[PDB]
Design an enzyme around this catalytic site. Structure first.
Site, mmCIF file in Angstrom:
data_model
loop_
_atom_site.group_PDB
_atom_site.id
_atom_site.type_symbol
_atom_site.label_atom_id
_atom_site.label_comp_id
_atom_site.label_asym_id
_atom_site.label_seq_id
_atom_site.Cartn_x
_atom_site.Cartn_y
_atom_site.Cartn_z
ATOM 1 N N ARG A 1 -21.162 13.442 -1.053
ATOM 2 C CA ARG A 1 -20.587 12.653 -0.004
ATOM 3 C C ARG A 1 -21.524 12.525 1.177
ATOM 4 O O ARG A 1 -22.017 13.530 1.714
ATOM 5 C CB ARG A 1 -19.200 13.180 0.422
ATOM 6 C CG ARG A 1 -18.693 12.388 1.587
ATOM 7 C CD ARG A 1 -17.167 12.428 1.794
ATOM 8 N NE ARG A 1 -16.874 12.429 3.231
ATOM 9 C CZ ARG A 1 -15.639 12.347 3.733
ATOM 10 N NH1 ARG A 1 -14.601 12.231 2.894
ATOM 11 N NH2 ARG A 1 -15.427 12.432 5.051
ATOM 12 N N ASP B 1 0.827 -1.202 0.000
ATOM 13 C CA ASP B 1 0.000 0.000 0.000
ATOM 14 C C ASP B 1 0.878 1.275 0.000
ATOM 15 O O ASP B 1 1.802 1.392 0.829
ATOM 16 C CB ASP B 1 -0.959 0.031 1.190
ATOM 17 C CG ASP B 1 -2.225 0.779 0.866
ATOM 18 O OD1 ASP B 1 -2.208 2.010 0.694
ATOM 19 O OD2 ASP B 1 -3.235 0.103 0.771
ATOM 20 N N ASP C 1 -1.546 0.221 -4.786
ATOM 21 C CA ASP C 1 -2.807 0.858 -5.063
ATOM 22 C C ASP C 1 -2.769 2.358 -5.293
ATOM 23 O O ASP C 1 -3.795 2.935 -5.719
ATOM 24 C CB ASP C 1 -3.784 0.571 -3.917
ATOM 25 C CG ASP C 1 -3.331 1.183 -2.528
ATOM 26 O OD1 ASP C 1 -4.226 1.575 -1.759
ATOM 27 O OD2 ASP C 1 -2.112 1.324 -2.241
ATOM 28 N N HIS C 2 -1.577 2.946 -5.096
ATOM 29 C CA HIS C 2 -1.254 4.390 -5.310
ATOM 30 C C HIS C 2 0.085 4.615 -4.559
ATOM 31 O O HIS C 2 0.569 3.746 -3.817
ATOM 32 C CB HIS C 2 -2.257 5.399 -4.703
ATOM 33 C CG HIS C 2 -2.537 5.135 -3.273
ATOM 34 N ND1 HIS C 2 -1.761 5.665 -2.245
ATOM 35 C CD2 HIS C 2 -3.414 4.263 -2.689
ATOM 36 C CE1 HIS C 2 -2.150 5.122 -1.097
ATOM 37 N NE2 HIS C 2 -3.116 4.234 -1.338
ATOM 38 N N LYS D 1 -5.811 -1.998 6.511
ATOM 39 C CA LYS D 1 -6.181 -2.245 5.116
ATOM 40 C C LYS D 1 -7.118 -3.413 4.923
ATOM 41 O O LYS D 1 -7.336 -3.933 3.757
ATOM 42 C CB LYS D 1 -4.926 -2.394 4.243
ATOM 43 C CG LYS D 1 -4.059 -1.166 4.279
ATOM 44 C CD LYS D 1 -4.690 0.107 3.713
ATOM 45 C CE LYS D 1 -3.683 1.265 3.841
ATOM 46 N NZ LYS D 1 -4.214 2.581 3.381
ATOM 47 N N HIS E 1 2.500 8.184 5.895
ATOM 48 C CA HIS E 1 1.691 9.346 6.267
ATOM 49 C C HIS E 1 2.352 10.161 7.425
ATOM 50 O O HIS E 1 2.019 11.348 7.617
ATOM 51 C CB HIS E 1 0.233 9.006 6.673
ATOM 52 C CG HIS E 1 -0.681 8.747 5.528
ATOM 53 N ND1 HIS E 1 -0.967 9.697 4.560
ATOM 54 C CD2 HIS E 1 -1.446 7.666 5.233
ATOM 55 C CE1 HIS E 1 -1.819 9.192 3.690
ATOM 56 N NE2 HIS E 1 -2.125 7.966 4.078
ATOM 57 N N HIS F 1 -16.525 16.768 -0.993
ATOM 58 C CA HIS F 1 -17.965 16.639 -0.701
ATOM 59 C C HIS F 1 -18.890 17.112 -1.779
ATOM 60 O O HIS F 1 -20.100 16.752 -1.775
ATOM 61 C CB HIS F 1 -18.295 17.420 0.550
ATOM 62 C CG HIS F 1 -17.720 16.838 1.773
ATOM 63 N ND1 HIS F 1 -18.426 15.966 2.579
ATOM 64 C CD2 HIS F 1 -16.503 16.982 2.332
ATOM 65 C CE1 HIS F 1 -17.657 15.611 3.586
ATOM 66 N NE2 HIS F 1 -16.481 16.213 3.460
ATOM 67 N N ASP G 1 2.152 2.963 3.194
ATOM 68 C CA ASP G 1 1.189 4.024 3.268
ATOM 69 C C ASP G 1 1.030 4.516 4.703
ATOM 70 O O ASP G 1 1.038 5.722 4.954
ATOM 71 C CB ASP G 1 -0.170 3.512 2.799
ATOM 72 C CG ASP G 1 -1.150 4.663 2.509
ATOM 73 O OD1 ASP G 1 -2.283 4.687 3.035
ATOM 74 O OD2 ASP G 1 -0.742 5.557 1.714
ATOM 75 N N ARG H 1 -11.787 24.122 4.374
ATOM 76 C CA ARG H 1 -11.229 22.913 4.970
ATOM 77 C C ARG H 1 -10.664 22.030 3.898
ATOM 78 O O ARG H 1 -9.546 21.565 4.021
ATOM 79 C CB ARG H 1 -12.221 22.040 5.796
ATOM 80 C CG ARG H 1 -11.390 20.835 6.269
ATOM 81 C CD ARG H 1 -12.115 19.710 6.933
ATOM 82 N NE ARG H 1 -12.440 20.082 8.265
ATOM 83 C CZ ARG H 1 -12.479 19.289 9.333
ATOM 84 N NH1 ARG H 1 -12.174 17.996 9.312
ATOM 85 N NH2 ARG H 1 -12.851 19.842 10.460
ATOM 86 N N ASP H 2 -11.454 21.743 2.869
ATOM 87 C CA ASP H 2 -10.927 21.056 1.688
ATOM 88 C C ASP H 2 -10.189 22.004 0.738
ATOM 89 O O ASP H 2 -9.705 21.559 -0.274
ATOM 90 C CB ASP H 2 -12.030 20.320 0.912
ATOM 91 C CG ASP H 2 -12.854 19.365 1.793
ATOM 92 O OD1 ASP H 2 -14.136 19.320 1.701
ATOM 93 O OD2 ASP H 2 -12.245 18.745 2.687
ATOM 94 N N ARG I 1 -19.449 25.406 7.078
ATOM 95 C CA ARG I 1 -19.610 23.962 7.071
ATOM 96 C C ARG I 1 -19.601 23.351 8.483
ATOM 97 O O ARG I 1 -20.185 22.325 8.695
ATOM 98 C CB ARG I 1 -18.594 23.272 6.121
ATOM 99 C CG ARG I 1 -17.124 23.421 6.454
ATOM 100 C CD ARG I 1 -16.526 22.009 6.574
ATOM 101 N NE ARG I 1 -15.936 21.638 5.367
ATOM 102 C CZ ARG I 1 -15.581 20.448 4.922
ATOM 103 N NH1 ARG I 1 -15.748 19.283 5.542
ATOM 104 N NH2 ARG I 1 -14.995 20.486 3.754
ATOM 105 N N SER J 1 -6.727 4.568 -1.148
ATOM 106 C CA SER J 1 -6.873 3.137 -0.899
ATOM 107 C C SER J 1 -8.221 2.633 -1.273
ATOM 108 O O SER J 1 -8.359 1.490 -1.731
ATOM 109 C CB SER J 1 -6.535 2.763 0.558
ATOM 110 O OG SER J 1 -5.202 3.015 0.847
ATOM 111 N N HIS K 1 -0.570 11.041 0.011
ATOM 112 C CA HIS K 1 -0.372 10.220 -1.185
ATOM 113 C C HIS K 1 0.334 11.006 -2.320
ATOM 114 O O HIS K 1 0.529 12.218 -2.217
ATOM 115 C CB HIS K 1 -1.668 9.682 -1.706
ATOM 116 C CG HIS K 1 -2.405 8.799 -0.729
ATOM 117 N ND1 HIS K 1 -3.703 8.412 -0.932
ATOM 118 C CD2 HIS K 1 -2.027 8.253 0.458
ATOM 119 C CE1 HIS K 1 -4.109 7.675 0.092
ATOM 120 N NE2 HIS K 1 -3.118 7.578 0.953
HETATM 121 MN MN LIG Z 1 -3.694 2.631 -0.273
HETATM 122 MN MN LIG Z 2 -3.435 6.521 2.958
#
Ligand SMILES: [Mn+2]
Ligand SMILES: [Mn+2]
Length: 503
Positions: free
Chosen positions: A255, A10, A436-437, A328, A399, A121, A395, A151-152, A183, A60, A454
């Protein structure tokens, strides 16, 4: 029984720079021996190739959904974007019934949503498309209830989306801001009903401050040190006539989690968070289905995925194992099976508990050794056709944005990978080693600060079959075809990806 295994590292990708690149700095002699011995390529796990907007890093959930599906699985933002770009949106039955309800009641159309381009969202460009549709169908009164982001997207950016939206109202000659809420209030997800009731009360022209313009109320908020997310809901003077019997609402958020509560207030008959008199004859439309206690018309209904890898395995009388540690485990189960919890016939699963630490730099090996020892015990049973394994570490540790522990995480995984893959080869089986990334490929900015996200980088593929050549590029939806190819199982038409092995 000869096993075929997909082994997902991952958050492990290919990046040219070595700087802050734990993949390249780690000692990974097993991976390197397999990579040098066996056919290899690299595939895309971000953006359009996995059903996300261009430039958006993979993840993920979306990664494991694409892996398991053997096709590009379009996520909501892109699905809706594409519906707009090619016209179906303006034909949508649910939106046009919303409009027919208003037109036929001479009532008002309300639109609710997160007014930004965050894309987690909502997307505010979907508001513009709704305004266009309403204008095409001749609706007169459109009231927009703005929920502000911060926020985003940048924490003080609301004024620019508001400005552009005000120009849209003038360009189309339709729509007005009726209420404006952070929000924090409109999109709470922890049943803090006090916050919600403030957003409700402004939407409804009951109790709230009023300002002459959306800009004015936001500017007043900034002045008190309260940025976008936390703007106290307010009504826009002379531009709000309430939510009245016969009205329609369209909520453009896609979302579910942060949109459900506000929707229960309006359209859950059993709502008891606080006391309300609900609107009579309300047509309440949501872009997606937020939960099963909201009486809403669903604009973009969920599509169930038929013939994911696990369902194909089942229908060829194969046995399969899904295995990962906690972090995971939903990925190799639920998401892998196309958003299905139920096990397939012949499916068994192994959950290994992750360590209980706030951040995984504190134990970079996590539970990788116990995952591997579980998998060895399973393979020694000799009864598995298909294995789907995820090693979480790169992963989850990556992070942390800390290089030495992410390196150790990768080195732990490489030790386990050697044991797993050599056992599979011993059994005259095959492994596909991939990811997966990205993530651990970059854990430092170019100026040496922690980088905790990521990446958009492409992911390696190693297929442990001799005398075969892989295709030069491809995507995550190609992995399950490649498994079926290795298993000599026929691929059905609804798996549109393509085996990475050349023929
Ligand atoms: Mn992943
Ligand atoms: Mn992650």
């Amino acid at each position: 029984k000869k096993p075929t295994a997909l082994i997902i590292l991952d958050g492990f990708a290919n990046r040219e720079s070595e700087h802050g690149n734990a993949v390249k700095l780690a000692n990974k002699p097993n991976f390197d021996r397999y990579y040098n011995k066996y056919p290899t390529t690299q595939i895309e796990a971000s953006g359009l190739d996995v059903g996300l907007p261009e430039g958006q890093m993979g993840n993920s959930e979306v990664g494991h959904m694409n892996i398991g599906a053997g096709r590009i699985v379009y996520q909501s933002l892109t699905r809706i974007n594409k519906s707009i770009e090619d016209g179906d949106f303006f034909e949508n039955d649910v939106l046009n019934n919303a409009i027919a309800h208003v037109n036929s009641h001479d009532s008002a159309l309300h639109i609710f949503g997160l007014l930004s381009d965050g894309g987690v969202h909502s997307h505010y460009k979907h508001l513009f498309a709704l305004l266009e549709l309403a204008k095409k169908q001749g609706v007169e009164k459109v009231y927009v209830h703005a929920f502000l982001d911060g926020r985003d997207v940048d924490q003080k950016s609301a004024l620019k989306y508001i400005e552009e939206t005000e120009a849209k109202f003038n360009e189309l000659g339709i729509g007005q801001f009726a209420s404006v809420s952070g929000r924090y209030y409109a999109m709470d997800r922890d049943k803090r009903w006090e916050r919600e009731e403030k957003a409700y009360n402004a939407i409804r022209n009951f109790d709230a401050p009023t300002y002459a313009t959306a800009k004015e109320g936001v500017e007043a908020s900034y002045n008190e040190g309260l940025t976008d997310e936390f703007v106290v809901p307010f009504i826009v003077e002379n531009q709000n006539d309430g939510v009245n019997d016969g009205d329609a609402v369209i909520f453009y958020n896609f979302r579910p989690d942060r949109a459900a509560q506000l929707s229960e207030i309006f359209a859950n008959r059993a709502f008891e968070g606080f006391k309300v008199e609900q609107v009579k004859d309300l047509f309440y439309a949501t872009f997606t289905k937020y939960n099963d206690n909201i009486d809403a018309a669903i604009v973009f209904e969920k599509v169930d995925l038929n013939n994911t890898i696990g369902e194909i395995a089942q229908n060829n009388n194969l046995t399969q194992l899904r295995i990962a540690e906690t972090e995971k485990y939903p990925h190799v189960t639920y998401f892998m099976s196309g958003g299905r919890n139920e096990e397939f016939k012949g499916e068994r699963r192994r959950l290994i508990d992750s360590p209980k630490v706030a951040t995984y730099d504190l134990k970079p090996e996590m539970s990788a050794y116990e995952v591997k020892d579980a998998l060895l015990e399973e393979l020694n049973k000799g009864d598995l056709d298909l294995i789907i394994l995820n090693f979480a570490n790169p992963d989850m540790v990556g992070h942390s944005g800390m290089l030495e522990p992410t390196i150790k995480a990768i080195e732990a995984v490489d030790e386990c990978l050697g044991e797993v893959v050599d056992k599979i080869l011993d059994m005259d089986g095959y492994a596909i080693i991939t990811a997966d990334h990205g993530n651990s490929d970059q854990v430092l900015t170019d100026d040496d600060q922690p980088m905790t996200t990521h990446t958009t980088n492409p992911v390696p593929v190693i297929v442990t079959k001799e005398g075969v050549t892989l295709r030069e590029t491809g995507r995550l939806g190609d992995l399950a075809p490649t498994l079926l190819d290795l298993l000599n199982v026929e691929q059905p038409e609804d798996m549109t990806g393509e085996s990475l092995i050349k023929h």
